[PDB]
Amino acid sequence: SHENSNSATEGSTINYTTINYYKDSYAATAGKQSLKQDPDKFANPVKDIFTEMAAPLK
Amino acid sequence: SHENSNSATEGSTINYTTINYYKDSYAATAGKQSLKQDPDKFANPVKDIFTEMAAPLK
Amino acid sequence: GDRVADVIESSIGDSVSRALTQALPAPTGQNTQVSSHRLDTGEVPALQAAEIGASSNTSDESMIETRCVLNSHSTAETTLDSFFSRAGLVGEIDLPLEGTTNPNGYANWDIDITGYAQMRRKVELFTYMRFDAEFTFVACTPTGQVVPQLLQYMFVPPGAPKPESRESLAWQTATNPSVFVKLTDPPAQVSVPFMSPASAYQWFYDGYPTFGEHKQEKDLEYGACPNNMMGTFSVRTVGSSKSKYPLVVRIYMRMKHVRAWIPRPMRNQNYLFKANPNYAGNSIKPTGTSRSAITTL
Amino acid sequence: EIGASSNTSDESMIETRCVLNSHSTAETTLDSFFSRAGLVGEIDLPLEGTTNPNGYANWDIDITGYAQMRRKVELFTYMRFDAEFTFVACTPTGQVVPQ
Amino acid sequence: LLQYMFVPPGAPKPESRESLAWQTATNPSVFVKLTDPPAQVSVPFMSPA
Amino acid sequence: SDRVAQLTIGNSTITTQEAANIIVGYGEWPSYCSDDDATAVDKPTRPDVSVNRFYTLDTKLWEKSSKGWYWKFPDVLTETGVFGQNAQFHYLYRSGFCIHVQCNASKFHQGALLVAILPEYVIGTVAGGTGTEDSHPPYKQTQPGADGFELQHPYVLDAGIPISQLTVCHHQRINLRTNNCATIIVPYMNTLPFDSALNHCNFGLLVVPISPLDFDQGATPVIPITITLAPMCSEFAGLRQAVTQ
Amino acid sequence: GFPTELKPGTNQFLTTDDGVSAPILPNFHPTPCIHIPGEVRNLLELCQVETILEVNNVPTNATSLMERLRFPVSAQAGKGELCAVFRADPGRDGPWQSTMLGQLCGYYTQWSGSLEVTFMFTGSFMATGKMLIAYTPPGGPLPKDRATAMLGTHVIWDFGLQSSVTLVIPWISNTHYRAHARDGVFDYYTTGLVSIWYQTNYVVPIGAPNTAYIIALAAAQKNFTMKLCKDTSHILQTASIQ
Amino acid sequence: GFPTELKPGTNQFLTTDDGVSAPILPNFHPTPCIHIPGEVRNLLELCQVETILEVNNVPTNATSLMERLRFPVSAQAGKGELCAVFRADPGRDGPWQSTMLGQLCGYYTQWSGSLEVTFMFTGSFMATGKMLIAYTPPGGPLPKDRATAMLGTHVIWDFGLQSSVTLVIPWISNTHYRAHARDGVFDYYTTGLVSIWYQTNYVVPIGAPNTAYIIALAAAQKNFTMKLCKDTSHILQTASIQ
Amino acid sequence: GFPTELKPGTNQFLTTDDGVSAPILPNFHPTPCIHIPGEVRNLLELCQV
Amino acid sequence: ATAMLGTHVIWDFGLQSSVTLVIPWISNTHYRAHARDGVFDYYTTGLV
Ligand SMILES: CCCCCCCCCCCCC/C=C\[C@H](O)[C@H](N)CO
């Protein structure tokens, strides 16, 4: 419990489930990540979103 | 407690008693199985069951 | 929008598997009850009909005069967990210095556990199997001598590039899993998941994997399930030069979390090939041994 | 032309059935894709020769000398990670020695 | 490297070093190096009586 | 109320006066594929009466020196009816079966047949006899259609596995003193919820005389055996042009 | 620097250790499992199924290997003759090797419980007869006559509608468990003999065939148990697979 | 002197072990992280982006490598001719190697789910036409005519305001997951074919050009998943970097 | 990577150590025990005869 | 093999010496007139 928060994800929205036997958090396991996706960020990056049914160009 | 349910029996009626030091459940021990039998499935697979005393062909 | 009665009263779309059976707990052997003489008509528990295809539902309480026996014998050793969680030889790879098989410091061995008869016949009792595994690599010299040598055990799944030599660039194991060991150290031991695209492996595939006309040219495809081809296990001597210790790696596989479906007749004839239930038709052997007369033992 | 991708489905384009997908998205994480130890360097300490014949060798850290791990990180432009290095020392023949 | 195989009654005894009973598919076996400590296995009460 | 049976499915009907009972294979009735178990998103066609009905393949003659025959499923029904066109026109397939085998003879004939269902009945070869050749069986012999193929070495079922232990699979016995029919109801058996009917065969149907037929001359020497089989709970998916093999 | 001391049993590979090994693949989730029918949960499901006990293990050539699954029943002189005899020892080399019970018991060293033997008459409907199927417990030599065999356990089976009788070979042993008999000292574990005698005769009218056959079908019961898994012995292999 | 016993799996380096290693630097706190845009959290974000599927993989020389990203559409004789055909197998050597889906799937061994193929018309506004884009499931040979191809899945696409249609190649497989097809036994894992046929014709007025081009753009869907990470095979390297 | 340090007394076989060894046979249940008469529980029963 | 595709029964001789085949009503029309040679073959019921 007494250990330095000094990994490269301290200050990230995702929470991990790690094992560590040291005071340095970057020595811990890779753990399990959170399963959260954002495909809209790369695949539909438009200011004015449009639906499936809507023909986009009116 | 935080570990992936990723063994080849996750989704089986039988419950195990395993030991694991990893997050991968397929690394765990073989454990103890449940002692449940179904000999009727191979030995008396008939639509119309008949008793011991009943002569089967009436 | 269902209106006619020929579709309201239907059983189409009934996905629930209707079973006649029910698995009940049998931790111990069945106990025996006390039985007496019966001198009655109508009820005949000894006369059966094997024509039905079922087995005899008779007892010894119905056929002899018995005593109360409390059976405390456990059914825990006939489980698949106990019957299969016993590490057996599934492969054996030689890395000689010279010769004809692998004289160039590396060897690929396509995974089939059907090269040694002792573990094959024990899994070929069933048609479908779904298990995790634990492989174990026992590396040594032909003489059994242990030597100070470093090895690399790479798993090459399907699609991935097989290594053509010892200094090939596939040994870099960036995404492929690999293991490094010294032979002065204990045997390696990794645990493996169920890695097939199907819900179970199957040692017998009655059919062809490819479409198209089936001639004598490509007749060797009969029986090949690609849902069982988990790939290739490669091994080299880690180095830029030729080793001086000949080596033999033996692979010992142990199942865990076993499930199995559809038992089969066990083989009574000798295996001859891998993934092929062929036999010598000239030398057919009975599955037992003989007598000279049926009245004399 | 908008630059976005198709928001279509198979529910909109064919007649489909209810499929309950129980396939996990846990193996496409960066944790799983990159937590696989790969070769990034290789140093030789020969006895004679031209490279390092004097019992020492310096190797400036760049993990861009072997194509298998390079191309896998050069898929991205920025990366922030901890690491775990592992040093597998041996003779050219693979022989292990007391050194 | 040695192999310590337990061959119960009924099971096939090995006739040579390269015999096929050493595959230890159901029989229990132990592999050891002699540079390592002595092996040590625990055993149950295995008699029919 | 057990030796008589009327099997009615579709526009077909089999009456029996000398039955034993009906075997339900592995204690499971045929069924349709759940949404949990399915993976293909296409909506499958479920034709309920045009393919779920009894078909009648051909007759085999039980002579004295008969050795046995096998029929591979669903190769029996790929050139027969509305079933065998949908199987051609589609890529996937899923059905159970109700097999029915008829052999009628007098009360002065005697004999027994074993009628067994062996899943994934892979066929072996004699390896040239010597055991040196890695020969493979032809397509005539692997998938022989509805005219079946006869066994050369029925003790080992032409696969190296013994006939004696075949009663661990489904089976009934046709004892000419006791019965002349054998009804086995088979579910769908595969690792996959769906598979192609033209490449993969799910099981084989073995018919083997364990006891030889015997009669005194004067009687009728011709004793046929007819296989009669119904798909059950059939499903098809993946529609493209028709292909035969 | 947690101090420890390494004990004997280190750096040994025991093939029957139920331990934790290291995974190769992280966050792998396997293909989900569907309902496949025929899930075997215990091998004592397969020991209760009746399979063919080949008593007539006389022939050796290729064509007559189908003769080995049925033993004949002709008409005799009515003097209570002997039809057939066979030992009741499953793991022993004989008729039971042709049975699943006799092949799974090779993978185990000790067995205990009652057995079933089912005989089915494969003759004409007009054929009729009666047979005495006796179980002679241990100590009993081969009986020379039927009056010596009835003293053991027996059934009398009249052919009729139901073509099948079952003889239960009951558990009679000094020991709780019983190992595999063979020649010599391991004769301590014999289960006994089973013998079949003509009670009356095999009676047949004009026209029907004067000879029939009986098919034996052996199994086990709900009280059967096996123990101490080994590697089988009554099947061997010529080396050099492929 | 806590007694222990060392098991197999000791002194081995497995490259895929998620364990604890020893730090070199104590009490090091790294540089804090800022909001950088474009955080990738899963690679199935990059499999849903449409990238160019180069069907016209005919040229080989240097100048005509830009010809390989668009396939032409001229005017025909109206007999329902064939324009183009390509397999629907992403991991297989062909048009999909030019796609991110076809390059990330090389790093995995098994895939499952539906695919998208988007075709965009790059012709004149006065140009008009109709095409049939068929998906022929497995078993289907190469269709010789359009009437054989409509029996599969298909769309009919009329050029107009919206220059783009999408064909969803739906998930039709016996297996839950599907590995990488190739010549021989691994043809069990083929996904099928995709073929494009002139429904009517490519109609054009006076003055406008008598030939156009179509640009294919392939992606995946929200139900797509990959499994069992491996090392890619359809890119190799000549050794001796620098 | 739980750090440990190995102490003296390692890789030694002491014949009088009451420790845990590895089993060869999993899920083996032995033959049950009956009432046999004459159970010796201590050798100071036999020194009084 | 061509005839089983229609409606059928399989009849085993035994105790009950009689089977019945129901020829079911399969017609496009509600009512059906008397067949004969020529145009009135539109009203055939089939074969047995
Ligand atoms: C670091 C090395 C790890 C090696 C892991 C190897 C993975 C093997 C998984 C087990 C596969 C089960 C056996 C395969 C199937 C059958 O034996 C044949 N292919 C079909 O007859």
Ligand SMILES: CCCCCCCCCCCCC/C=C\[C@H](O)[C@H](N)CO
């Ligand atoms: C006791 C020895 C410990 C050795 C520790 C080495 C520290 C290395 C930290 C990882 C650095 C990441 C990779 C470096 C950046 C890039 O590869 C290149 N420099 C830029 O192309």
